[PDB]
Amino acid sequence: MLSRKGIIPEEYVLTRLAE
Amino acid sequence: VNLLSKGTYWWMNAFIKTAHKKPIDLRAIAKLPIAMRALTNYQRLCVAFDAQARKDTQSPQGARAIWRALCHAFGRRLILSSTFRILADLLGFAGPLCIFGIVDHLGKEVSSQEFLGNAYVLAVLLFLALLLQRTFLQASYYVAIETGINLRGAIQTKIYNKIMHMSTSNLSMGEMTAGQICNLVAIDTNQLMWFFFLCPNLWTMPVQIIVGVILLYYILGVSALIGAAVIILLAPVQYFVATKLSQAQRTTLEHSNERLKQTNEMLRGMKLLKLYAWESIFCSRVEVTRRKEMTSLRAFAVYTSISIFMNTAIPIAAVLITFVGHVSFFKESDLSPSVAFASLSLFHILVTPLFLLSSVVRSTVKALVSVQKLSEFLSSAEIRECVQIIGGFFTWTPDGIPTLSNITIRIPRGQLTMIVGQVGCGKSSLLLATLGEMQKVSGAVFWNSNRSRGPVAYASQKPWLLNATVEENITFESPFNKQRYKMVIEACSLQPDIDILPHGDQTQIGERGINLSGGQRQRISVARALYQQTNVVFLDDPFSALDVHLSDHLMQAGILELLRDDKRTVVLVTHKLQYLPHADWIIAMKDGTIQREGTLKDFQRSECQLFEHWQRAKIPWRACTKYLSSAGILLLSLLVFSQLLKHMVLVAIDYWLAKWTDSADQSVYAMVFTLLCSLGIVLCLVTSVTVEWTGLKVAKRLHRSLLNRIILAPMRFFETTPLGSILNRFSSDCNTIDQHIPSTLECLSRSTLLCVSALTVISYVTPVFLVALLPLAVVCYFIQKYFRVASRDLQQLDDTTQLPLVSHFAETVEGLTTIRAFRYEARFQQKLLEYTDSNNIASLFLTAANRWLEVCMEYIGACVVLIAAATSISNSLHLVGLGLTYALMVSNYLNWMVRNLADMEIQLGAVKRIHALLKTEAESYEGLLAPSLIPKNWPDQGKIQIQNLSVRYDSSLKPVLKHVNTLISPGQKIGICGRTGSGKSSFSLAFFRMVDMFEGRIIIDGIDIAKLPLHTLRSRLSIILQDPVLFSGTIRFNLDPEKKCSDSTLWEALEIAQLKLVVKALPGGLDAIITEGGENFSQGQRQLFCLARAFVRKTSIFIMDEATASIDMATENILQKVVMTAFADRTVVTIAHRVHTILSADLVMVLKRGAILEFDKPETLLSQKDSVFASFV
Ligand SMILES: CCOc1cc(CC(=O)N[C@@H](CC(C)C)c2ccccc2N2CCCCC2)ccc1C(=O)O
Ligand SMILES: Nc1ncnc2c1ncn2[C@@H]1O[C@H](COP(=O)(O)OP(=O)(O)OP(=O)(O)O)[C@@H](O)[C@H]1O
């Protein structure tokens, strides 16, 4: 994986409702 | 789809050509087959645990038992992705072997051994073996994903099927909340899904090391053993940096999470902060949190400028160790070009597995943890295995200690029963146990109404509102009948809620939406039970929670008529005993046990009655606004020049490597390869550091600008733009432009610049490659164009699908007992299986579009293999191995150039969102006077005169006030109230220069209020709004953060309102931490804060607003405190919602419909005069 979108993800993030 | 086209994903081509013209809705990517369902894989997983629990005498579903169950259910598809992975890798090995053959039969000039003695023939059997490396690799990529995605499907179900059986005790539900179990579904399940994405790699990568050792040894020798040792002894220090990164990344996440709570307090309470001139204080409170978050993201950047560095530098040092050791230590079979340009490809292959092996073993550890977390969850407490209770011993402790015993409750059909008792008498507990949610130690609860149970309506005491429309929260997945709904809306007074809402019946209510008032939240929950037409209604204190008093009367008058007409039995526990001996067949319990049961007259005859008597656009403008504006030339040019110079060294390291192998000037061959590879290694460090450094210097000066130009915005913007819009672009886009862009920026700027470099190597090796590359590049352009357009759409359709799934795993857990009470399990079960299958069908087509790109782009790259081989040989009979070892890489550069390009494009769009916020600014602070000499030491005269001020918000056609004239002299404490929808709230806010008085003049204390700086105005005139919330912090700091007056003054100000007893007898005192929302002081404390701000500012004027709903005794206490506030100030122009507190005034202005209707200079003539008395009565 020369490009890094690798499997080391921080899964948890919070995003409120759009608009 | 057949095997001829399933391996190349030919069916995508009709899906991506339509996705370019139209967009992708869920109706476009819609159908989901039988094998890839959540239910089908869940049925397979139940079979696995059943066949284990038949086979296993040892019972429980421990972590050993889950892995045996997953293997027996998903082995037959994991073997087909490890078999294809072993063959994709082994056929991949043939590629290096072919390079060795090509260059041997080039230079210096049984029939099958001579068939592979060629270079024309050997290129074709190189080309027609790379088509099998590149098709088997994808087939095993996809099968791993398809099997992995299925585990997402059948574990989220098998998690959710226990949420349908979890016990809501204070032991179990008290320990693990919804936040714990949501991160099991969100965080944990993904890292068990990702283990099955990487499950063949821990099988395959050990083969790669073994063959990689063996073939490199056969190609070059015992020097290959020394070289491949240096990679495998730098793989554990690849692991240490990847461990320390995730350690620091957790720190950064748990630090900015605390920042986002502080930012939520600033955005949600920007109204009261802007009016009290307290936007700058909370700004510098979040900026210091950003300082500490920036030093945490710096450590993230340091440990991620090594990960890039170790990935590149460690192989190059290993390769140089191999050859220089094969030259300095012993050169027996020196570097002929067939040997050297072939073992570069053997290392260029083993660059990738060994430094991805560190991150596989990482994701095996996380899988071991995840089945530890899931098995410790999946052995929680099961629930169990008209209403007449005989013995009734029932506990919340799963062994012993009944909270309700000797409960002999009888409730036959055709009934209406109140339940009253002490606060803590086992009353709410009796209803939940009656519904079947607590463990019957003895007795039984029986049933026969219209083993065998009954669907029962339920209202929780802490009310629960699903995130939906208010109508849809009321309807609650039941057929809409607008006559029943109409009766409910009027009865609970939902008309003022709908009108005050931004949308009404379409308003997003509950959690993740409008955090309504607690009584308003209670009214929504109460109405659902009445609407639902369930055969029995159990209301757990609606009247004791009933905020609106006349509606509380009306609730009982509607609930009597509804119960009597429907003949739906109703048990309504409350300890408001107004109806309690009238017509309720009451059941009073005391101290956990039933005390008396019988008719109402029996309780009149038991002498306890007396007690009751008492969309297609790239964004180069946002990318130009990102880099050139934020970073500055002094490190933009260094990053842009170090990228090119690192990437000219990578051709210069290879170009000179070619020109030494021809000779196979020996110590000059060594002294330029060492002095090129070392500077090549050195430039790797100073480009990996400069990428991540520029990320930190753009993340800072974006967020600092974003905060300090949204705390410079008018409050009319905060009411016009939603606070979810500002906060999402705040929180999520700052995470992308900190944690996700610069790594992608470095990876794209490495990959695509190397991609052009690799196609430069080919085009100079065969200098009529320009003819060869012009048609093939066009096809590469078109696949690029139709992939970005496609996989942006499926990208957001992935992400905007995950959130309604995890919000369902919140709303199931919080309002759990409602769902089990309606006997309603299987209708929130099926909403999951639509939410689950909407996430998998938008993740499968994301990965099938990913595989379509890779199959198609590699076939473009394999054409580069054959054409670079064929045209170079026919040239070199008239630097060919080095050209041919680059053609293998090009098949795996064109992939990741496109893959990063799409991802960078998606990430770049998070910078345009922030710059759209940074163009919204108004509400100037200019004082057009002599700005320090014309205002004196304090404007506190109290002479607020209005001269025909015409004020509005809409700025287009709709004024609120017109022609108003009012001159409250110093001391004229003139509480002005008017018509209830006309102008009253507007009058209070506009006085603080926060609305557009489009004409006239409004002088205050001899100075024009329009010609003063907003900071000066807003500080020097206090207020108290309707029902505000509290900022979390120290108590003196909450009362006055920038005080600098005195501490004795703060005590005098706090005591002068109320709550000095609770302030003194708090466990903190003057530095007491306000516990995250003001859940422990008062609503009076806001008046205390207003009193402290008024006294500390040394003003006389004050504009005071209404009060929503509280203890009227506390409000009379507040009114008396306002009189006490008057008996310091003597000037106040205070509006009021209910006029009966406003009847003690000194002059009164009555406003009707949006004009001045009356101006009564006494407040007693108002009772005589008809228009004012009509508003008074
Ligand atoms: C949703 C995950 O979808 C995938 C899942 C896989 C399976 C797989 O081994 N993955 C990891 C490897 C780990 C060790 C980093 C990976 C992830 C991202 C990019 C490339 C890679 N490597 C693949 C192995 C060889 C070098 C690069 C492949 C590709 C994809 C994909 O659609 O991008
Ligand atoms: N899951 C649980 N586990 C253990 N104890 C519980 C649980 N749920 C409630 N309780 C306790 O049992 C009591 C049940 O209600 P209570 O006896 O207070 O009747 P109530 O006063 O009408 O209800 P409330 O006071 O909650 O309005 C609560 O006081 C609470 O302390």
Numbering used by the authors:
A (entry chain D): 1 to 19
B (entry chain C): 222 to 330, 346 to 621, 678 to 742, 765 to 928, 992 to 1041, 1060 to 1273, 1280 to 1578
The authors write:
Uniquely, the sulfonylurea receptors SUR1 and SUR2 lack transport activity per se but instead are devoted to forming the ATP-sensitive potassium (KATP) channels, wherein four SUR.x subunits form a complex with four subunits of an inwardly rectifying potassium channel, Kir6.1 or Kir6.2. KATP channels are gated by intracellular ATP and ADP, key features which enable them to regulate membrane excitability according to the energetic state of the cell. In pancreatic β-cells, KATP channels composed of SUR1 and Kir6.2 couple glucose metabolism to insulin secretion. The SUR1 protein has an N-terminal transmembrane domain referred to as TMD0 that interacts directly with the Kir6.2 subunit, followed by a cytoplasmic loop termed L0, and then the ABC core structure comprising two transmembrane domains TMD1 and TMD2 and two nucleotide binding domains NBD1 and NBD2.
Here, in both the RPG/ATP and CBZ/ATP structures, we observe strong and distinctly shaped cryo-EM densities within the same GBC binding pocket. Density for RPG appears compact and palm-shaped, and suggests that the molecule adopts a considerably folded shape upon binding to SUR1. Interestingly, RPG possesses a carboxyl group adjacent a benzyl group, analogous to the sulfonyl group in GBC that is also adjacent a benzyl group. Refinement of an RPG molecule into the observed binding pocket density orients this carboxylate towards N1245, R1246, and R1300, which coordinate the sulfonyl group in the GBC-bound structure. However, unlike GBC, the RPG density is distant from S1238. This explains previous functional data that an SUR1 S1238Y mutation does not affect RPG’s ability to modulate channel function. Interestingly, although similar in overall structures, we noted subtle rearrangements within the binding pocket between GBC- and RPG-bound states. The most obvious is in W1297, which in RPG is flipped down towards the ligand. Interestingly, in the RPG-bound structure the piperidino moiety of RPG is in close proximity to the density that corresponds to the most N-terminus of the KNt. This observation agrees with previous findings that the increased affinity to RPG caused by Kir6.2 is due to the peperidino group, and that deletion of only a few amino acids from the Kir6.2 N-terminus decreases RPG binding affinity by more than 30-fold.
